[PDB]
């Protein structure tokens, strides 16, 4: 038997390694993905060969990721209950989807991953990987051993050779999260000194600094005048935003399993992109499609959140971002300081914007009909009521 | 033949008066309301009368403002087009009401305001009118005039005896809203001490304020601990809040007559409550309650924005946020510092959120079934495509 | 230990009813409700105490059924998938209601029910009993036995003393649903005969029979001038439109668990219902309030479908469309032909529609106005496509 | 000048053809569409050269018309106040294109409509025109001219020689129209034999009739196995439809320019082709996807009834259903019946349903998994709620 595990090189998916090799008596074969958590994945590649993976892959996933998941999703102005980004959401169906396509080659029945029986990355995980190939076997040890508690895990990896090293984190090129531990008393604000992606505001430059995006079709192109492929893209915002401290948020949010989790996020090339993106589409988007679109947007964040990316509603809502996004063509100007993001201007070569319009054809007479006919329901409504 | 003038006091409203008494051959009753513009609305009164009101109300309906139009529009988390707070829409609607409240009492056929034939206030006015009392004659000189020009204005007014004198504002208890010149070039920053109600963040101080709001069933109550009016506790959170110079947002819009327009607001109490009052609801909604809640408030916001106050769509919604929000009950904690309003924490009496449910009752197996029946669409779907 | 079971008298509840006692050793209540089923549920009561009930208890929850779940689902205009009325939807909430209360009362610390474990009634259950007492225990004997086949049921039966005797069958006072066996096949019409409820289109009356329903704030309060109660009347709207044949579907649906089973349903005093409020609701209800209330109504649909009756979601759109509802006042003139139900005529004390607005409310200009401000953005948006 | 005008061939638009060339000594170019009104344009086209056309154009649109207008609607599910199937708005949009086509071609200036200006029409028309050339420019003699009263028009008409003679009606393909004289008492029912397209339900066949219609990717192509044209093919099924008295709807509608009006429609192909595309759908279709459809048909259902057919809001949402629709393969088999349409079968080369998922991937314990997962919030907050 072969089990291809997603194995992030810490501890938890070391003793994972361990734990699968001698309760499944299965060739582990290691997948770790670069996703931009700041890490020599090659490390981990070899750790798990240490480990005992009869096989170790490591691939350099960026460029995938950026431009076949964050810029669909980014298309779609999805937010998830107000204010998170989805930074882990997005990247799990990667991971699955390369978890899956390894088992097929390698000739493994099974794929296994370390999210816990509690949280949203193990739906996001086996529902990508049912929905890929759905006679995959999944195993999920979190659900299926029984460690009583971090001492008698730490004892299992110290009795394995594995070695053993105030709150959980999950990084990637998106955004780093932060959840867990500490973080645990919604009243209680994070430690100084947490974030490591962003800057403090309070230690950002005294200078405002201005940043231009370019968009084309959709999808941002260029930053500051320079072409940049999506992954190189993100990566200059996330360092011009993350000097400014810009991206921070804090929630209590819901998980698809139903309990509150509080999460503290990081989000600094995403949220300048946030604002630059609804920027452009100010001068390029028709009103009733953008307003349409704002309606929808939520139902899909919350599709990327739950775990269903490879599914079909998720892929239908897509046609229809996608459609209204062709239209996301100009440049996007913003001023950051100290945390803050600011839209300072705009323009577009089909800018849908009039001064004509605005400045004193249109005749102000029309407008007095338009009224009238706006009107006339709810006169009669006050004329019945009387 | 009565006229019923919502005046603001300026030049433009002065000249109309002149003109509507002429031109219609009526004595006209002046309305001056003082809804936090920040000036002497006894002044515009005593004004309208040298100018030729047969009789000039004022009004202080600050209080009224925020408790039957403000707070109910924030309990349903009205944001139109991504970020306008709607501080001038939520307000015509409460000038128009005590316009033909007063026209009713005065024994007036009709009543007047100065708002443009190409801006929004016009529809918000006369939709307000017709609605509460439709047999009311509406009289917009701006669409019926034949003033071809400014300076032909100026000299009407001086011929008038009305005293004569980069950018257009209204300013109110939630906000300040700057519009046309300079400001109509999208691609231009806004020029450098525009802003009024809010301290630009670079002199803004140093050191981040933490301030505490109380919600009880859906509205503000107390700031600090200090219970608070609705008008004194957005007051007093529009002080907190502009020294540090939050709430400013750059849009183009799209205005309900069919054109792109560049505003500029600053709404700094009410970003503060916006953020506190989704805190408090954290803890406070439930899940799919929220989820629900976030696809109607864009709705409900175009509705406040076109002018359907009252109306009967908007008093639906209304009822649908008002069953909701009245379970926010609680209290947020935020962190203001340089433009920005950081969440850094929240508690409620009735929290929904439960510790032992993240920390490490609740089965982790559980969680294979739930995905499993989750998934088994998709398997289907798989197995089909073959 | 005591268990209270949801004893419907039949084959397999009789046969649980041995199960349970066997497996659990506990004293089984059973309680059976009558809903309209057309049975004696005195005959159950007592075939429960002869199969070995402690107690056995039977409430006649007709009126219940009708005014506290199905009218305030019908205020809805609640549409499962385009044709499902959701006959056995809104009935299992009430059921599972008296479970817990009696169980309360019993002092037992377990409920039980027969629903299979593929289908949506589980669901429904269990979810009403967790929301109303979170730490019950509840118990599904299909999900926990061991029976292996319909022979070993019934030879379980046997050797236990239990009566024993193409499709399942599920009746109450609102419809009949008929699922299950032959009608396994989507590309299989039901067999002649099946239709207990309504009478066979091709056998009912050759002259059309009118019919009149009387609606106050939302709910029918009489039929053809006389005020019945609201169990009365729809067993009233029952007979007049089963003798018509009217109410039958025959559709695939989704069902919670994840796959599609092929349902019919005929539902006679509810389809008159149906179009019977929409009559009314067309003289009452102002358009837009109508659009939104519609475009909600699918979603309320998929709740009361998947069992989330007693949730918050539900409960808060309750709100909204019981605001609305409270509009609808008036009569419906429907017209019964061999198994189609047809309006022909409406009318209401507060109807808002006005013949002087049709017959040959405006002036001839203010639709021109409301044309030319309508079409303002398509021009610019062709203009810029020049 | 030369003008354009959309001529019918009726009373009312000879009329307008007169006081055209009259009024504004116009070159009159008529233009009549066939669009399966039923009638010979020819004469229509001979009665325009007669009456006074410098130029008449007769042209047989009835493909183009359900090809690139009737089906994409219905593939949709645009249904507008849950019954009307958009008969009249989704042939406007068609006529207008050529209109203005014809006026681009003949280098006219102005084009013309004889829509009054009470109804929905003269929005159809002029927002098309519009939207396809913003600088055309309009007339709409309804609102321009003086005639008051019926009686003026025919003593104007008998003036000038035109032909002169309960309500109005306007046919094409998809359906027949009835509105206006005495349908204007919604609470009177339609006058025996006013139906024209359709036999009436009590003089309709004796037997049932079985009908299969087959989709490919969202259109139906073929009946009874018989592969025919888009118009040839809703001609078929209106001719069985009609003899069985199918698709007659009876409702008081919201017109765009404010006021209620009772309608009376005939559909019978387009009504089987809803409930055939429904059927294939329930095999073809995802869940979500289709919940979500859905919620989205009856906004896409105003836009075609307003008249923004050729809007950016409308075209982006045909994105969305167009993507859902290509799924959609298969074969519904119908009965018909005494005016009823029922599903009795349908089957799909791709069909989403198993047999072995329903009869007695899927077992047993994940049901009460996912139960306990989805009752995790509800336990909470009973919970919390003490
Ligand atoms: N870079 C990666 N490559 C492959 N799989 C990954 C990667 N990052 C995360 N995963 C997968 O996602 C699952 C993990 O979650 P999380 O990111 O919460 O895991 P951990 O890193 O294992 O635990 P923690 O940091 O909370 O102690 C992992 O157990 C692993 O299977
Ligand atoms: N405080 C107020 N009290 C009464 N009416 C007001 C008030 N503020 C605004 N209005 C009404 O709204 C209309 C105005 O618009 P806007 O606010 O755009 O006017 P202005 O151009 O600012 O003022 P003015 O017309 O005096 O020069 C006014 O002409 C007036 O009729
Ligand atoms: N009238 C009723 N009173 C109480 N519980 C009922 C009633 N009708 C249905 N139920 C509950 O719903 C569950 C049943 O389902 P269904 O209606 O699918 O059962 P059956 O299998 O059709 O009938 P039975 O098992 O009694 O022969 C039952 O096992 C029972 O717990
Ligand atoms: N077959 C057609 N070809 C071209 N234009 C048409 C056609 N049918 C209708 N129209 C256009 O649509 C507008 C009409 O409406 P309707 O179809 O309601 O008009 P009528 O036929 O003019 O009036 P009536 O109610 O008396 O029959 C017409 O005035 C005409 O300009
Ligand atoms: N530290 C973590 O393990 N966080 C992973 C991201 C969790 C985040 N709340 C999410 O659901 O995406
Ligand atoms: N300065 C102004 O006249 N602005 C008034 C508010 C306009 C704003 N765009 C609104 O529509 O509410
Ligand atoms: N015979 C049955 O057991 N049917 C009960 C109704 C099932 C229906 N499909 C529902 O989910 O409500
Ligand atoms: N007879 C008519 O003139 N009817 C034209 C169609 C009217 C229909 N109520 C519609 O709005 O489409
Ligand atoms: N990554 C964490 C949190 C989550 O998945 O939501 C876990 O495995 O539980
Ligand atoms: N107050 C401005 C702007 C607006 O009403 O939208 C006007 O009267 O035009
Ligand atoms: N009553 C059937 C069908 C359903 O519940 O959906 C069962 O118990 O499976
Ligand atoms: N065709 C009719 C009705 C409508 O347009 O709605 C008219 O011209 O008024």
Redesign the interface.
Known sequence: MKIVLAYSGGLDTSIILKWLKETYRAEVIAFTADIGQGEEVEEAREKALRTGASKAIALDLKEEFVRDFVFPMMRAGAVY???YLLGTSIARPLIAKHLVRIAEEEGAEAIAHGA???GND??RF??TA?????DIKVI?P??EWSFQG?KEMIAYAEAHGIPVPPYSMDANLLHISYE?GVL???????PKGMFRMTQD??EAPDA?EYVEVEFFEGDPVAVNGERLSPAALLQRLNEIGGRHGVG?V?????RF??????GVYETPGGTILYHAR?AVE??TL??????????LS??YA?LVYYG?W????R???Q??FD??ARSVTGVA?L?L????V??????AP??????D????G????????????????????????R
């Open positions: 209950e107000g204010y816990t029986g509690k193990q739906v086996e529902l049912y929905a890929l190939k759905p999920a979190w659900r971090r867990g645990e008393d919604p009243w209680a604000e994070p505001p309070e405002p921070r804090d929630i209590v949010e819901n399993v139903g309990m509150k989790s509080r609804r100010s001068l028709d009103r009733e499609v953008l307003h349409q679109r704002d309606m939520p139902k919350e269903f490879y599914a079909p509603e892929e239908a809502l046609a229809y459609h209204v100007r001023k300081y100290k945390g803050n600011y839209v300072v201007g705009r323009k089909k800018s849908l914007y009039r001064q319009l605005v400045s004193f249109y005749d102000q007479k029309d407008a007095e009909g338009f009224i009238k006919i706006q009107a006339l329901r709810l006169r009669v409504r006050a004329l019945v009521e």
